[PDB]
Amino acid sequence: FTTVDNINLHTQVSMTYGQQFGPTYLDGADVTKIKPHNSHEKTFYVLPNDDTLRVEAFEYYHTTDPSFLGRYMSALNHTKKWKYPQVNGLTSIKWADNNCYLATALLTLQQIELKFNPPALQDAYYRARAGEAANFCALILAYCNKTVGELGDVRETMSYLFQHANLDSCKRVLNVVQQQTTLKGVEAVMYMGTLSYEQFKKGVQIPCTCGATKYLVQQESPFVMMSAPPAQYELKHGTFTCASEYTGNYQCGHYKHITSKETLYCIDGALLTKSSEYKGPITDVFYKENSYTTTI
């Protein structure tokens, strides 16, 4: 049977699989060169060749890029080989093929409230919290055009993931000095420049178009992401939801994830380290907000 979304299966009935069905993938491995066998007979992924499959493909993945299915299947061939151990109630990834940014992003995703627009992302996202995050990690690579082993940046991975999610209800009003602007969607949840969410509310010096300082006026969202170039940062118990640590040179460095439970927990792959106070190089800090109205 040939399916493009795995929730809409179509029946089909020597000649290589590629000449019969086009590009054919079984369990994330190309069987285009492979011939039919009595063992193969099952369910095979195929790039859509008719409008019925093209419509079903968009309904599940929300993309029409034909290379998407091939890159997703190729990424899935590696992710299912990875082990996904659960540490401190969170589904992480055992480090393999430079996935330190994937695991840090996966740990951060389970702790922020997010609804994905494509059903493929959402179904795998629920499966990811359950412990089966193979399809979810492969989809992340496919939507981000990143390949397995490629060096990935967490705040960029989040940026593309936030674009494929419902952030319409998120909103941010910023005033720079008196001129205030409104940011909606991904811009409302992300800011590059500083890690302290308090500093963002108090004001940050920004280049004036005339010459200014930038302060937050209103924030209606379920969370806020604060990004900055990697620098030594002090993390206190209860001030942050989670953070991402970067230790190394540009692109080459390793990614580590710190979360704030009853004590600060630090997750590197499958390893977990606990400390009451943690000071280290941090590039992204995540904060939980529901509504903010400035006192200014």
Ligand SMILES: Cc1ccc(OCCN(C)C)cc1C(=O)N[C@H](C)c1cc(-c2cnn(C)c2)cc(-c2cncs2)c1
């Ligand atoms: C792992 C990785 C993979 C891919 C990747 O791609 C980026 C290019 N992209 C456009 C495709 C980046 C990274 C990556 O090293 N990220 C860390 C967080 C980082 C960031 C920044 C940074 C971000 N903004 N500014 C203004 C500075 C600086 C450094 C360092 C500089 N000197 C020593 S460390 C490290």
Ligand SMILES: [Cl-]
């Ligand atoms: Cl879309």
Ligand SMILES: [Cl-]
């Ligand atoms: Cl989408």
Ligand SMILES: [Cl-]
């Ligand atoms: Cl918080």
Ligand SMILES: [Zn+2]
């Ligand atoms: Zn969409």
Ligand SMILES: [Zn+2]
């Ligand atoms: Zn691999």
Ligand SMILES: [Zn+2]
């Ligand atoms: Zn001015």
Ligand SMILES: [Zn+2]
């Ligand atoms: Zn404490």
Ligand SMILES: [Zn+2]
């Ligand atoms: Zn790494």
